[PDB]
């Protein structure tokens, strides 16, 4: 297109005036230079330094090598004996990284954004590898197709000048600039130019903070919208680094009646104790024009949805108003409010569910559905059933997974999990969780001590260490096989928790791309988690990443489920004492195992 032709046309003026400005800049900058340099020179004028002397051949070496420099012009050649240097000890290779103690979500990357560099000799015959990597990313690399540069100002000027005579222009701009690469930005700029107005920092429906001066009475939903939309329940955090935010809000049923509801005199301005409001409270089941601030009005609106019957408590929280004034205001305002649903549940049955062997029956059903090909474990996600029960259409049921406490499955669902009951330790084969590999949640197993001693650091359960994270002290040093390694400090028995294997989490295909570059150097840190995710420790993790491979190791890895999340733990295969190195089998394919790891450290004993 002729977009450039116009760009230069304005650039004639823009470059002209700009020229002047930059000149005014130069004169300024050149001034500051003149100052700073001078200052430095002054300091240099305050020093005295020894001169160097020519090399003198010491008698300590009668026979040694010498170097001579040939002169291209008319000068002679000097000869000087060489000087040797003392030796120093090197250490194996390493790359940058940062410490971590949990998993970390990472979004997929679609643009290469950088081109590796090999030794400049390997690719001399195998240059095709670059093109294959390019095809893997489909030719998208940052900087490529730049076709110059754009500051978004000349683009706006052209859009304003490019009057009808929007779509084709946007497509051309996207093609000529990877930075924009979309007509959505073009339309956003068009809208901004047409309107050039913004309601403010608060969303389009402005919601000033309660603790600010700009008080405005608003209903409960808008006041709690941000809180409900931002919180993640699983980790009890805002904007969790390992949970997507796509979930339903807190609009859920709850026990409507959970209060004593005992009438009593709330005080002098008591809502009760007056025949008007005292009977009006039951009915709804001369006022004063107090200075109900908008913030206070919104506070009353929100607080009504917490008790629905307590003027005393609400007025106690809202210091601006009074309990009797609160009742009067409800009679004025709350009288025009909409009715509440007031739903609840009973759940009488307790007897038949006691046997609970039908739960094992349904587990057998789930297993026999796909028992043979059950190798495909799937990521957990809370299923939602608003009206229908947890039938075969249940997302958890189809997922072949039990329903965690976060699911919307009814409180008496048959797909849920009962929990442990063991007495001594939830560690042996008889434990139910230990069989279906899990960690006893501290809300179900009240027997093994998992719930108990949450603040203290001593529990009987040996199947709850990962949650409490009691890893062992580890030391770093060069390994006896290849590069670095990890060494253990204190003795440990067999089948004991050592530590976790943390790192970033990515999709399978995403991990496939990084595997291509990792393969070229024959070094990798990719660990398979489940059928959907792969964990990479290349850029984040902890010491355990350095553990080496062995065909007869003393440690083994276990993939486990904890609170609906997959984790990886390392355990000892035999009694281990001070100072021994740790290994485990990478379980690679034999061909790749030999290609990458062909060190055994030991010959054939027999």
């Amino acid at each position: 297109k002729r977009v450039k032709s116009e760009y230069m046309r304005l650039r004639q003026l823009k470059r002209f005036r700009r020229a002047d400005e930059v000149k005014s800049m130069f004169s300024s900058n050149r001034q500051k230079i003149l100052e700073r340099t001078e200052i430095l020179n002054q300091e240099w004028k305050q020093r005295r330094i020894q001169p160097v002397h020519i090399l003198t051949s010491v008698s300590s070496l009668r026979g040694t090598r010498e170097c001579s420099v040939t002169s291209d012009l008319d000068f002679p050649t000097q000869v000087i004996p060489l000087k040797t240097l003392n030796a120093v000890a090197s250490v194996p290779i390493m790359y940058s990284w940062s410490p971590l103690q949990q998993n970390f979500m990472v979004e997929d990357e679609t643009v290469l954004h950088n081109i590796p560099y090999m030794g400049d000799e390997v690719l001399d015959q195998d240059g095709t590898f670059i093109e294959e990597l390019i095809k893997n990313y489909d030719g998208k690399v940052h900087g490529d197709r730049e076709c110059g540069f754009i500051n978004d100002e000349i683009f706006v000027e052209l859009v304003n000048a490019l009057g009808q005579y929007s779509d084709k222009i946007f497509e051309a701009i996207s093609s000529m600039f990877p930075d924009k690469g979309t007509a959505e930005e073009l339309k956003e700029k068009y809208k901004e130019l047409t309107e050039q107005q913004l309601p403010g920092a608060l969303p389009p429906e402005c919601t000033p903070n309660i603790d600010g001066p700009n008080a405005k009475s608003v209903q409960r939903e808008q006041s709690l919208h941000s809180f409900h939309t931002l919180f993640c329940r699983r980790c009890f955090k805002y904007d969790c680094f390992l949970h997507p935010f796509h979930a339903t809000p807190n609009t859920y049923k709850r026990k409507n009646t959970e209060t004593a509801l005992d009438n009593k005199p709330c005080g002098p301005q008591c809502y009760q104790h007056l025949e008007g409001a005292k009977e009006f409270a039951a009915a709804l089941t001369p006022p004063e024009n107090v200075e109900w601030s908008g913030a206070e009005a919104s506070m009353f609106r929100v607080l009504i949805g917490t008790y629905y019957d307590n003027f005393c408590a609400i007025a106690r929280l809202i210091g601006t108003k009074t309990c009797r004034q609160v009742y009067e205001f409800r009679v004025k305002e709350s009288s025009i409010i909409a009715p509440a649903p007031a739903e609840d549940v009973d759940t009488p049955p307790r007897k038949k569910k006691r046997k609970h062997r039908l739960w094992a029956a349904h587990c057998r059903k789930i297993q026999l559905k796909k028992d043979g090909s059950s190798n495909h474990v799937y990521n957990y996600q809370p299923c939602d059933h608003p009206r229908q029960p947890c039938d075969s259409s249940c997302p958890c049921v189809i997922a072949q997974n039990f329903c965690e406490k976060f699911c919307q499955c009814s409180s008496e669902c048959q797909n849920r999990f009962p929990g442990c009951r063991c007495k001594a330790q939830c560690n042996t084969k008889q434990c139910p969780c230990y069989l279906a590999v899990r960690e006893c949640d501290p809300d179900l197993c009240l027997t093994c001590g998992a719930a108990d001693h949450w603040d203290s650091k001593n529990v009987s359960c040996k199947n709850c260490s990962i949650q409490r994270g009691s890893k062992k002290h580890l030391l770093l040093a060069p390994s006896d096989v290849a590069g670095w390694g990890i060494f253990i400090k204190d003795p440990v028995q067999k089948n004991e928790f050592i530590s976790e294997y943390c790192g970033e989490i990515i999709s399978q295909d995403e991990a496939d791309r990084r595997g291509k570059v990792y393969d070229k150097y024959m070094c990798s840190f990719l660990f398979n988690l489940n059928n959907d995710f792969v964990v990479d420790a290349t850029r984040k993790g902890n010491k355990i990443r350095f553990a080496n491979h062995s065909v007869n190791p003393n440690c083994y890895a276990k993939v486990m489920m904890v609170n609906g999340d997959h984790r990886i733990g390392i355990f000892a295969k035999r009694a281990i004492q001070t100072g021994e190195e740790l290994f485990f089998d990478y379980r690679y394919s034999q061909a790749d195992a030999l290609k990458y790891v062909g060190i055994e450290r030991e010959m054939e004993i027999p």
Binding site: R364, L435, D519, L526, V534, Y596
Partner: peptide
């Protein structure tokens, strides 16, 4: 696409539940 497959470190795991008491 996605024809190739990188070599990952995988640790398999399986488990039943129980046989009802008789």
């Amino acid at each position: 696409q996605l024809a190739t497959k990188a070599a990952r470190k995988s640790a398999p795991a399986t488990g039943g539940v129980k046989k009802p008491h008789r």
